[model samples]
Target: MQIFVKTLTGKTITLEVEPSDTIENVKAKIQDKEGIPPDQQRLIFAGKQLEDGRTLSDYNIQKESTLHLV
Candidate 1:
């Protein structure tokens, strides 16, 4: 799925990633695409933070959703 990553500055970029969409994986992809390292990339969903140990399914998803990036 194409996840919408909205940064603190209000920039939304779509990351075309898949099945391996864990917090770690997503953050890693964000790093390669946006130059923001995984450690510095904050993933927030509904005000709740993401966990590297959790899968994207834990969040159960989005194609039309906006993920908070800080």
Candidate 2:
């Protein structure tokens, strides 16, 4: 499945990654695409911190989902 993400910097990007991917995995992809280091990338979902091992399913992400990264 694919997901759309909006960065704190106001950039939007689409990732064609598997829905089973962990937050850690998504972090790596974001770092590569956004040029933000892993440590610098912050994944926040529903105003909470997103940690490693949490999948998209854990958050019940849907098509046209909107996730924020700061």
Candidate 3:
């Protein structure tokens, strides 16, 4: 599925992810694409913090889900 992620700077990036993929994986992609270190990335979705070890499905994340990264 495709997800939209917004950065603190208001820049948004589209990422392709699997439901079983970990948030850590997302962060790594963000690190590569946006230059934000994984450890420095904090992701938020559905008004809650996104944990690195959790899968997208675990948080009920769907296609076009909007995530905040800072």
The whole-model lDDT of each prediction reads 0.79, 0.79, 0.92
lDDT of 1 by residue, 1-70 (tens): 7778898788888887664578898888778877987777778888888888787778876666678886
TM-score: which is higher, 2 or 3? 3
Better of 1 and 2 by TM-score: 1
Name the candidate that leads on TM-score: 3
* Residue range with the least summed lDDT across 10 consecutive positions in model 2: 58-67
Worst 10 residues of 3 by lDDT: 31-40
lDDT of 3 by residue, 17-62 (tens): 9999999999998988889888888999989899989999999999
TM-score of each: 0.85, 0.83, 0.96
lDDT of 3: 0.92
The candidate maximizing lDDT is 3
Per-residue lDDT of 35 in model 2: 84
Task: Estimate, for each residue in 5-66, the C-alpha lDDT of model 2 and write its tens digit.
Answer: 78987889888777788888888888888887887777877777788779877887765676
- Model 1: ten consecutive residues of lowest lDDT: 57-66
After superposition, candidate 3 runs with Cα above 4 Å error: none
Which residue pairs overlap in candidate 3's backbone? none
TM-score of 2: 0.83
CA shift of 61, model 2, Å: 1.4
lDDT of 3 at 9: 95
